[PDB]
């Protein structure tokens, strides 16, 4: 029904929000510290000097294990 299409759209949008803001391909699994923005995969987060969201200096990257992780890179 049309209701099925509405639910599919909601699911798709939530799943897209879980992807890296730089490559758009890998799941987010890294936090810029100390600001806390958690918007990149490990590869894309590795070379950024400053946060792509708030411009704060990145002192280090903290890896995050989330319950919503479903990619092979994060389930292994």
Ligand X SMILES: CCc1noc(C)c1Cn1ccc(C)n1
Contact residue for a copy of itself among 23, 24, 46, 66 (CB under 8 A): 66
Contact residue for ligand X among 6, 11, 17, 24 (CB under 6 A): 17
User: Dihedral of CA 27/62/37/53: which sign?
Assistant: negative
From the list Zn ion, ligand X, a copy of itself, none, partner contacted by residue 23 (C-beta under 5 to 8 A by kind): Zn ion
Which residues form the interface with a copy of itself (CB under 8 A)?
A: 1, 3-4, 7-8, 10-11, 14, 17-18, 21, 28, 31, 33-39, 53, 62-68
């Amino acid at each position: 029904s049309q209701q099925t299409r509405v639910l599919q759209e909601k699911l798709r949008k939530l799943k897209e929000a879980m992807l890296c803001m730089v490559c758009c391909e890998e799941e987010i699994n890294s936090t810029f510290c100390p600001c806390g923005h958690t918007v990149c995969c490990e590869s894309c987060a590795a070379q950024l000097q400053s946060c792509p969201v708030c411009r704060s200096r990145v002192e280090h990257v903290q890896h995050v294990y989330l319950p919503t992780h479903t990619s092979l890179l994060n389930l292994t």
